[PDB]
Amino acid sequence: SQGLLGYYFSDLNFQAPMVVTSSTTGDLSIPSSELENIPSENQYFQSAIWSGFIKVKKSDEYTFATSADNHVTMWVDDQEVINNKIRLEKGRLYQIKIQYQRENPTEKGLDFKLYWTDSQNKKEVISSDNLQLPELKQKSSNSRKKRSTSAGPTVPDRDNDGIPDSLEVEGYTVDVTFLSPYISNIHLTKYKSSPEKWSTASDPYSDFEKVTGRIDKNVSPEARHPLVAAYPIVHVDMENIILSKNEDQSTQNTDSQTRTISKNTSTSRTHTSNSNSSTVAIDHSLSLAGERTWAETMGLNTADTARLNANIRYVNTGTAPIYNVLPTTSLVLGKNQTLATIKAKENQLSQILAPNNYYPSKNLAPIALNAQDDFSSTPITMNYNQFLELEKTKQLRLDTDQVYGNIATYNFENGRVRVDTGSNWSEVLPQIQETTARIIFNGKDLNLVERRIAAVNPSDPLETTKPDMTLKEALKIAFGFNEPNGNLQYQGKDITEFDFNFDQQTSQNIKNQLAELNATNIYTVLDKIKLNAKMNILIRDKRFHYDRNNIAVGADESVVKEAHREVINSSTEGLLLNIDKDIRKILSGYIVEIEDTEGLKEVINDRYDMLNISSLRQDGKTFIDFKKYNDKLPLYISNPNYKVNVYAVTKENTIINPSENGDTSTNGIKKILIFSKKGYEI
Ligand SMILES: [Ca+2]
Ligand SMILES: [Ca+2]
């Protein structure tokens, strides 16, 4: 992605840029054959400017020449060499500026080459190994000045990202790599960006770096748009836990039987601020014999303590990767009882933590909080009262900071992306947060995904130089909504299948906009609602009920019923159905009941911890197993007029402890009838 940077103009005076691109060698030509996305009238180039550096591998005297010296002025550093021998020294970098003007060319495109001749009189087009791009960064480097010589033309590029002011403001496209003005009736993505922000989203990648692919390949595709922020978002996923009674100096004997408690866990990133937090649910379903308390199970007295181990992974749901610092996490019981601080070793990561991925990767083992080969893992200890609290709440919280370490950035000297020790996420995130609107959307699998989109702040003059951002456009560019036939959709689902919720400031702002639009319904004017910096917008699938963490925990009876209508097979052994994956996510289990002729009901799996009777098969269909908690026996129906009733239990209606009186039965559980057939119908 290296060479000289070229601006090719339709007018004579460097005002109407048609193509911005880079060469590889001194051949700076663009044939008309490559100009499909330029209309023919504007393929006539009357002026051009090139910029970059020349690197010398042999100290010598050199003569520069082009294909059109009578139309050219060229500077090496501040020195005009065309408008002649110049001594250049090995190991040194010289700035190049070339301008070309030719009125009324008769051919489209441009045939243009840059040559040099050494002392041996050998003339050649300059090799790619001798040419570098300009330093299109916010600061110069030790060897590479960020501005070109003042002599000659200065194409307006107030932020030094390489994209001319006029294209950033008026609209541009990139084609396979030609950057050109966007023209409705020919074109491809329409980009606009701020001509005064090197990164319009205030992230660490320039607007030009994003649209030309001069960027970390791990940056999410949507964040190659100059108006979508590229930044990591990390939380911790806990997969399972094991609780152990701590040994004490008094117990000399360590030969005792296994008395640990092992449970699966389910973790979700939450939204209730710019914090990273996830909430863990400890499974309440049957795992051990008896119906003992956890203390009875593990042999804990009131003066004993217990410890927890667990398997975890880190999850990046953001748009940029992390390389050398994983964030620190606090493991919290109840509201504010910190049980552990979880850290990884800085500068010793075994892999990248990339967007839409895990650390460790899912094809590798997870991390154990107390690793078998770590002598120095701190025991995560609870006192007896804390242990009882965990038994009752079956909940933990993982609060993760935003300490993400160093950033891999592009270097124009060599075209490489490398971790830059001088660039840190902690210097970048505050400004992303301050200048963007935040949308949290759960249409991908019901988990909360945050994106930030550049948006004007009317009260910050710099931020008013950014383009207007509508709500519709933000959903398209940040989340991949599309609009086939007028209607805005996400993966086939109309936008009207999702609700809108806002913070208090954002809500008043939107309400005022709708009033100025005399619009009674936001869904019909999404192209006219403008976002502003610091808005917070939460968009959720309407089929579901949500808890205080905005985790999906249930759904209307009508929705759940309809989701279970399509029965494939029924028998005394169970039911086989096709159920939407999203529905399965909000269920904790099923209750199976036999109803006799007088209306009395026998619940088969009549325990709060015996509802986990469904499984997903390879075919993707669900089996509800009547036998599992019926002693591996099918249901015995003593009269064909008896009914088999099956009920679904949503998570919000799930009982996770015996009742106050000790009753472990299902009496009182709010449950949704989803199947009811007589024996002769089975
Ligand atoms: Ca610019
Ligand atoms: Ca810019």
Instruction: For residue 226, report the distance from its CA to the centre of ligand 2, in Å.
Output: 8
Cis amide bond preceding 360, omega within 30: yes
Instruction: For residue 137, report the distance from its CA to the centre of ligand 1, in Å.
Output: 11
Yes or no: domain 553-682 corresponds to CATH 2.60.40.810: yes
Instruction: For residue 198, report the distance from its CA to the centre of ligand 2, in Å.
Output: 4
Instruction: For residue 141, report the distance from its CA to the centre of ligand 1, in Å.
Output: 19
Q: Which ligand is nearest to the CA of 155?
A: 1
Amino acid identity for residue 424 in this structure: N
Amino acid identity for residue 412 in this structure: F
Instruction: For residue 207, report the distance from its CA to the centre of ligand 2, in Å.
Output: 5
678 annotated among ligand-binding-site residues: no
Amino acid identity for residue 41 in this structure: E
Helix (H/G/I), strand (E/B), else coil: 577 = strand
What are the beta bridge partners of residue 589? 649
Instruction: For residue 200, report the distance from its CA to the centre of ligand 1, in Å.
Output: 10
Q: Which ligand is nearest to the CA of 206?
A: 2
Q: Which two tokens stand for residue 401?
A: 């900071």
CATH 3.90.182.10 domain position(s) in the chain: 1-230
Which residues fall inside 5 Å of ion ligand 2, going by CB?
159, 161, 193, 207
Report yes or no: 636 and 577 within 8 Å, Cβ to Cβ: no
What are the beta bridge partners of residue 80? 75
What are the beta bridge partners of residue 53? 95, 132
Report yes or no: 586 and 544 within 8 Å, Cβ to Cβ: yes
DSSP 322: B
Q: Which ligand is nearest to the CA of 156?
A: 1
Helix (H/G/I), strand (E/B), else coil: 589 = strand
Q: What fold does the segment set 1-230 form as a domain?
A: Toxin - Anthrax Protective Antigen; domain 1 (3.90.182)
Instruction: For residue 454, report the distance from its CA to the centre of ligand 2, in Å.
Output: 12
Q: What fold does the segment set 231-433 form as a domain?
A: Jelly Rolls (2.60.120)
Q: Which ligand is nearest to the CA of 467?
A: 2
CATH 2.60.120.240 domain position(s) in the chain: 231-433
Instruction: For residue 193, report the distance from its CA to the centre of ligand 2, in Å.
Output: 6
163 annotated among ligand-binding-site residues: yes
Instruction: For residue 326, report the distance from its CA to the centre of ligand 1, in Å.
Output: 33
606 annotated among ligand-binding-site residues: no
Phi, psi of 230 (to 5 degrees): -110, 105
Measured in residues, the chain has a length of: 682
Instruction: For residue 135, report the distance from its CA to the centre of ligand 2, in Å.
Output: 15
Instruction: For residue 438, report the distance from its CA to the centre of ligand 2, in Å.
Output: 21
Instruction: For residue 155, report the distance from its CA to the centre of ligand 1, in Å.
Output: 10
157 annotated among ligand-binding-site residues: yes
Q: What span, in angstroms and rounded, lies between the C-alpha atoms of 593 and 635?
A: 10
| Structure determination technique employed | X-ray
Q: How far apart, in Å, are the Cα atoms of 600 and each of 208, 593, 594?
A: 72, 10, 8
159 annotated among ligand-binding-site residues: yes
Instruction: For residue 197, report the distance from its CA to the centre of ligand 2, in Å.
Output: 4
Report yes or no: 105 and 42 within 8 Å, Cβ to Cβ: no
580 annotated among ligand-binding-site residues: no
DSSP 377: P
168 annotated among ligand-binding-site residues: yes
CATH code of the domain occupying 434-552? 3.10.20.110
C-alpha angle 407-216-169 in degrees, rounded to nearest 5 = 95
CATH 3.10.20.110 domain position(s) in the chain: 434-552
Q: Which two tokens stand for residue 323?
A: 């390389």
CATH 2.60.40.810 domain position(s) in the chain: 553-682
DSSP 163: S
CB-side neighbour CA atoms (13 Å) of 122: 3
* CA-closest candidate to residue 400, choices 279, 309, 275, 311: 275
Instruction: For residue 26, report the distance from its CA to the centre of ligand 2, in Å.
Output: 27
503 annotated among ligand-binding-site residues: no
Burial 544-575 (b: 16+ CB within 10 A, else e): bbbeebbbbbbbeeebbeebbeeeeebeebbb
